[PDB]
Design a binder for this molecule. Sequence first.
Ligand SMILES: C[C@@H]1C[C@H]2O[C@@H]2/C=C\C=C\C(=O)Cc2c(Cl)c(O)cc(O)c2C(=O)O1
Length: 211
Amino acid sequence: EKFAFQAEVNRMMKLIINSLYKNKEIFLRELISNASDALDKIRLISLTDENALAGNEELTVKIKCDKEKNLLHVTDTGVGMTREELVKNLGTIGTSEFLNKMTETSELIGQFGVGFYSAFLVADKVIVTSKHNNDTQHIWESDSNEFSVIADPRGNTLGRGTTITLVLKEEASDYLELDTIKNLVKKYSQFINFPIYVWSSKTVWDWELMN
Ligand SMILES: C[C@@H]1C[C@H]2O[C@@H]2/C=C\C=C\C(=O)Cc2c(Cl)c(O)cc(O)c2C(=O)O1
């Protein structure tokens, strides 16, 4: 259940963090982009697999702030990841060129698709809960010094998809405020082909479409 990151990933995390230290709000853009890509994947799979969406009929991205618990959640109903894929996609990585280029960054991060790691700019801990059609629900967690993957004792709660949960750093508290999040979500979801919602307040509470 316990794993060490590949050397290349450790180097990558430091590069990403040291480069975007002055543009931290970009992590949200990357998580939303990853979510969109995951949704494109299942949409493609559904063209050839009629039962592809049986675990969850919607294709959405839902974001909610848990201020009390100091958590930010970004959930998509994309293709999801099996246990082996969580370990492979998040723990390992022409990567040498990218790194060479990085060390020698915002646009490059998005192009190589390693924007996930920018979450460490605002979080002391990142948790990834995922359910893929070929596996049971699992949880990946990391403080960046190592990571672990365990079967989710809550069972299959996602249906299908992935939830990125960020335990925000003391100084990243602003990202728990609806205004801030709504504002950022609207900016980075403008060109996403899937509907993105934010659990917001009007005091009654409900999902609010951002794009
Ligand atoms: C493996 C699948 C689909 C991939 O093609 C998509 C693009 C980027 C993937 C990056 C990852 O490492 C996992 C991941 C992250 Cl980090 C995320 O924030 C949201 C997600 O939905 C996925 C995912 O489930 O990704």
